[PDB]
Design a protein around this ligand. Structure first.
Ligand SMILES: COc1ccccc1[C@H](C[N+](=O)[O-])c1c(-c2ccccc2)[nH]c2ccccc12
Lengths: 223, 333, 53, 265, 217
């Protein structure tokens, strides 16, 4: 019901610190728990991921051997140790959690904490760019998969995190009521039945199948 | 006083006996092609239990299973890939019943504790917790069926049946009609209700009304019953090594599934899609596959090392799950 | 005492005798027709290549 | 000069007796395998495959020895003789190890009656099962790849090494009998058909074990100064059949004492 | 070949397997004993002396945990729920020993003992017999109606001879003299050493079971 991330990042360059997070009213011993960052203008991408039982310690390709995750199930505390701070750390950190049955991963998102310093790349392009929302109508979002996101099991990976201007994002489709998703092979379409003042926000699309879930590629559709 | 009542009751008995009585189904099914030989092989073997499992129920998606055994453990399964979805600890180790809600949100369990417990599967915080603990029966529960998301029907050894309400644990309807009720089958449309007792009899009630509609008499106690997919007939399995099929619109008996080589009772009874194969889990260390429309046995499902307790068939008829007194649950196809 | 049980018993059978009955042949024919109607989708009857290894 | 045998006439009865004993061993062990190795329900108990290992070891050893001892005077090559001697030695020490393992199992079954189901388990019953066979193989193959010029060192190291196990078996059975007697006398004091049955079952096994394995090892130990005669050779040849008699008596006794097998069949 | 979803869902099954494995070995160190005596014979006066449906009691003694199951007020067909107790270490049968004066429910107790002892499921389960309520039986010797209920039987007025005769009668009711074994304790109203007798009986039966399983027997 509540997931609080603590640790305000404002230190001199060349040092190390800890970024902690605690959960209330959760079965923390049976939850996987990722870590993500948000740049001032970018999407959401992995920086670390831990599974239940501490048997999977997958990291990110951007940084390796410097960031590490420590877990305490009896204490219900997960924290990140960072070393060799560089100039490209000015992001908002979040501690999304997930669980996998044989069912809705990335459900709850934390508040996040700041990280600032005191003073070969997958790219996607679309015919429509920054289409403004016309009042009195409904907007639809189109997307195409660069690779074959469909698996032999039929489990198409389709995540539609929506970020309102505020604190934390939410889920739309994990694989509201007005939000709907139509899929056909490599084509995906998000449809909104009715618009509202709370419907405005940024959307992000899926471009991940393998171990690194880097779905940070996404147009900013605020207007 | 007693003599007049006995004479009056005997008059009614003989009147109904003469009214409920030329052709036979087993004779009219002549000059027809039998199914042949059925020799389906085991496809999945499930482990983890260390006890004698007693009941199970297939999920509504034909992919999830629920299993309860003599140890305080209730297991949610995955028939496609063998994975333990969740394990639930029971307060009472003596359990004989299982139930999987059609919505998939709840499960039910009950045994010698005279109460039935409802567990909620899809909850926040990733935990399974008790939702209701219905009590009011003086005996041991024999079967439980989810009528809907809020209604459940329970048959116990107190010779009565109960229809409850999950929202308010008070009993909604009580059915009285002896001998211990041992099995329960729910109508496909969830409109009717049948229960077989230990007095070598079965009774069909009215869920909406609250009183018995019909009675059927065969002998020994009956401990297995199941509806036909049509909903106008059912099958019962007694302890006298005889299986029988009854029709609601006929109030009679059609044929007996018996063999001279078996003097062993029937533990579980189930059908398949279209009602062509009747699978009877016997207590002679193996199950049998009778032809519901024929008097000749078709196939045998051997491979269990103890008495077969439970037996289930998917909604789409894709697999058959069998459990026995050894802790292994097998999926056959 | 015994009068309540006596009334409860005697009232039941007389109600059961008021239900009309049809010939068992019609019910058997209906069951046979239902069985053969849905006989072309039965994986247990005809094994044709979900549970494969 | 070389292997010396008395005369052809007298070594017809010896060959006939050896053939009869081998045939009896093979048929009885085949019957035991048929009534035990059905692999249905009796495989659960570890002690049941401890006995099966002993029967398998005895049957080989008998197969690889009675047939190879009937052609004696072709020498062929030394490699074949060393190979067959190593195989026979490995089979014999594997049988002794299986006897030691089952004696240890029986000792534990009374030492810790409550913890017997946890101390002895199928996962823990295969490490010793394989370890004993590996030790048998390495101790059989040691002289071929080790120190040679068998010589008195190998002869003396194939003595005492099995004797400690043979004495530990007797010690375990003594302790079992003493504990059974103590339990019976405690029950009497609180206020026996178990102690008598256990003594009857154990006395025959122990007397057979001490009569069969005594004279042969005594002769081998005494033949340490390098002195021997034709009488010694003849008595060693005579005692060879008595030593082999284990493959005849031990599997039968071990598979017949248990009432579970009789109830099953 | 597994996906990221499936790979993370196999570790879940492994954790569940580990949890059931560690949990399943805690139920193998507890001894199961089944109470099956008459309701008014003194069961209520013996369960508390040692310290709806089935009642489970958990006791400890000599670092051994005992589970005691009392089917007190089930009032159902015993043939339909006695299967669950197959494999119980011992059955504790209790009688009042002073209900022969009802002239009879003493014959009812005899029939119940005959039915339980000769049951197919309990062909190898030991029975511990508790003859209770010695005070009234010993204090009624002045006007004991033993001759009244048995006019054709003659015996001494001493209670020891009657106790020996009735113990012999109960022992003779057994039909399996090779597997089962009936233990008699002569329990009293103010006894204290009742737990020791059952502990010794379960130790003896577990040693005999281990000997039978090992192969000596
Ligand atoms: C464990 O080895 C066994 C066990 C049972 C029977 C036969 C053998 C081996 C076969 N092998 O090692 O491949 C064998 C030897 C031999 C063995 C080890 C060390 C020295 C010799 N000698 C034999 C003569 C005939 C048949 C088999 C063997």
């Amino acid at each position: 019901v509540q997931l609080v991330e603590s640790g305000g990042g404002l230190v001199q360059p060349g040092g190390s610190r800890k970024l902690s997070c605690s959960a209330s009213g959760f079965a923390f011993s049976s939850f996987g728990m990722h870590w993500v960052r948000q740049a001032p203008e970018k999407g959401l991408e992995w920086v670390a991921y831990i599974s239940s039982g501490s048997g999977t310690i997958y990291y990110a390709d951007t940084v390796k051997g410097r960031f590490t995750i420590s877990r305490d199930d009896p204490k219900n505390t997960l924290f990140l140790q960072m070393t060799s701070l560089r100039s490209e750390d000015t992001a908002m950190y979040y501690c999304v959690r997930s669980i996998y049955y044989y069912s809705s991963p990335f459900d709850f998102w934390g508040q996040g904490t700041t990280l600032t310093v005191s003073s070969s790349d997958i790219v996607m392009t679309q015919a429509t760019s920054s289409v403004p929302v016309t009042p009195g109508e409904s907007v639809s979002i189109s997307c195409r998969s660069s690779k074959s996101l469909l698996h032999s099991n039929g489990n198409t990976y389709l995540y539609w995190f929506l970020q309102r201007p505020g604190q934390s994002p939410q889920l739309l489709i994990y694989r509201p009521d007005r939000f709907s998703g139509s899929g056909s092979g490599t084509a995906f379409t998000l449809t909104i039945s009715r618009l509202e003042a709370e419907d405005v926000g940024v959307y992000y699309c899926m471009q991940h199948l393998e171990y690194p879930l880097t779905f940070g590629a996404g147009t900013k559709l605020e207007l | 006083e007693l003599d007049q009542l006995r004479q009056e009751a005997e008059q009614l008995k003989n009147q109904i006996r003469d009214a409920r009585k030329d052709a036979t189904l087993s004779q009219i099914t002549n000059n027809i092609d039998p199914v042949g030989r059925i020799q389906m092989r085991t496809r999945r073997t499930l482990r983890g239990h260390l006890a004698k499992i007693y009941a199970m129920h297939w999920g509504t998606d034909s992919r999830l299973l629920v299993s309860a055994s003599q140890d305080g453990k209730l297991i949610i399964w995955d028939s496609y890939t063998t994975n333990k979805v969740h394990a639930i600890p029971l307060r009472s180790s003596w359990v004989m019943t299982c139930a999987y809600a059609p919505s998939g949100n709840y499960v039910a369990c009950g045994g010698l504790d005279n109460i039935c417990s409802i567990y909620n599967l899809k909850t926040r915080e990733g935990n399974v917790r008790v939702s209701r603990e219905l009590a009011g029966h003086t005996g041991y529960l024999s079967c439980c069926r989810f009528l809907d998301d809020n209604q459940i029907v329970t048959s116990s050894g107190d010779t009565t049946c109960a229809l409850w309400d999950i929202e308010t644990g008070q009993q909604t309807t009580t059915f009285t009609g002896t001998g211990d009720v041992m099995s329960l089958s729910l109508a496909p449309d969830t409109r009717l209700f049948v229960s077989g007792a230990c007095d070598a009899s079965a009774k069909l009630w009215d869920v909406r009304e609250g009183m018995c509609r019909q009675t059927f008499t065969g002998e020994s106690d009956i401990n297995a019953i199941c509806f036909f997919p049509n909903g106008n007939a059912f099958a019962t399995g007694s302890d006298d090594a005889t299986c029988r099929l009854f029709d609601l619109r006929a109030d009679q008996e059609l044929m007996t599934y018996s063999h001279d080589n078996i003097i062993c009772g029937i533990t579980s009874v189930s059908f398949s899609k279209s009602g062509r194969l009747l699978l009877a889990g016997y207590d002679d260390f193996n199950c049998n596959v009778w032809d519901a429309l024929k008097a000749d046995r078709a196939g045998v499902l051997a491979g269990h090392d103890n008495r077969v307790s439970c037996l289930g068939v998917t909604d789409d008829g894709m697999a058959v799950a069998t459990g026995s007194w050894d802790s292994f649950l097998k999926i056959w196809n | 005492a015994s009068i309540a049980q006596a009334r409860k018993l005697v009232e039941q059978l007389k109600m059961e005798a008021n239900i009309d009955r049809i010939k068992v042949s019609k019910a058997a024919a209906d069951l046979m027709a239902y069985c053969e109607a849905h006989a072309k989708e039965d994986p247990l009857l005809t094994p044709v290549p979900p549970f494969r290894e | 000069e070389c292997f010396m045998v008395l005369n052809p006439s007298q070594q017809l009865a010896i060959a006939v007796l050896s053939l009869t004993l081998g045939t009896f061993t093979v048929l009885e062990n085949l019957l035991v395998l048929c009534v035990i190795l059905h692999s249905r329900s009796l495989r659960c108990r570890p002690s049941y495959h401890f006995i099966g290992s002993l029967a398998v070891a005895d049957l080989l050893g008998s197969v690889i020895f009675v047939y190879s001892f009937i052609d004696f005077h072709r020498k062929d090559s030394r490699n074949v003789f060393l190979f067959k001697l190593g195989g026979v030695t490995a089979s014999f020490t594997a049988s002794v190890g299986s006897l030691f393992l089952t004696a240890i199992d029986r000792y534990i079954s009374i030492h810790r009656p409550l913890a017997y189901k946890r101390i002895v388990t199928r996962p823990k019953a295969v490490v010793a099962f394989c370890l004993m066979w590996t030790i048998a193989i390495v101790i059989a193959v040691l002289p071929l790849l080790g120190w040679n010029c068998i010589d008195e060192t190998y002869l003396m190291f194939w003595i005492g090494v099995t004797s400690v196990l043979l004495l530990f078996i007797v010690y375990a059975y003594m302790y079992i009998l003493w504990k059974a007697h103590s339990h019976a006398v405690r029950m009497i004091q609180r206020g026996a058909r178990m102690d008598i049955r256990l003594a009857k079952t154990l006395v025959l096994i122990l007397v057979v074990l001490i009569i069969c394995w005594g004279p042969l090892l005594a002769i081998m130990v005494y033949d340490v100064f390098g002195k021997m005669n034709k009488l010694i050779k003849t008595v060693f040849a005579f005692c060879s059949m008595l030593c082999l008699l284990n493959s005849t008596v031990n599997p039968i006794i071990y598979a017949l004492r248990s009432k579970d097998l009789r109830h099953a069949f | 070949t597994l996906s990221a979803e499936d790979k993370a869902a196999v570790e879940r099954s492994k954790m569940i397997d580990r949890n059931l494995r560690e949990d399943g070995e805690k139920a193998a160190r507890e001894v199961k004993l089944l109470l099956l005596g008459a309701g008014e014979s003194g069961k209520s006066t013996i369960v508390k002396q040692m310290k709806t449906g089935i009642v489970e009691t958990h006791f400890t003694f000599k670092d051994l945990h005992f589970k005691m199951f009392d089917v007190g007020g089930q009032r159902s067909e015993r043939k339909k729920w006695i299967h669950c107790f197959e494999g119980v270490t011992a059955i504790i049968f209790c009688v009042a020993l002073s209900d022969y004066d009802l002239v009879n429910r003493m014959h009812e107790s005899m029939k119940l003992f005959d039915s339980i002892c000769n049951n197919k499921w309990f062909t190898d389960t030991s029975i511990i017999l508790f003859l209770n309520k010695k005070d009234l039986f010993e204090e009624k010797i002045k006007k004991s109606p033993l001759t009244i209920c048995y006019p054709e039987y003659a015996g001494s007025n001493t209670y020891e001879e009657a106790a020996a005769y009735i113990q012999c009668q109960f022992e003779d009711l057994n039909k399996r003299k090779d597997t089962k074994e009936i233990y008699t304790h002569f329990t009293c109203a103010t006894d204290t050493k009742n737990v020791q007798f059952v502990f010794d009986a379960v130790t003896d039966v577990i040693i005999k079971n281990n000997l039978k399983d090992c192969g000596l027997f």
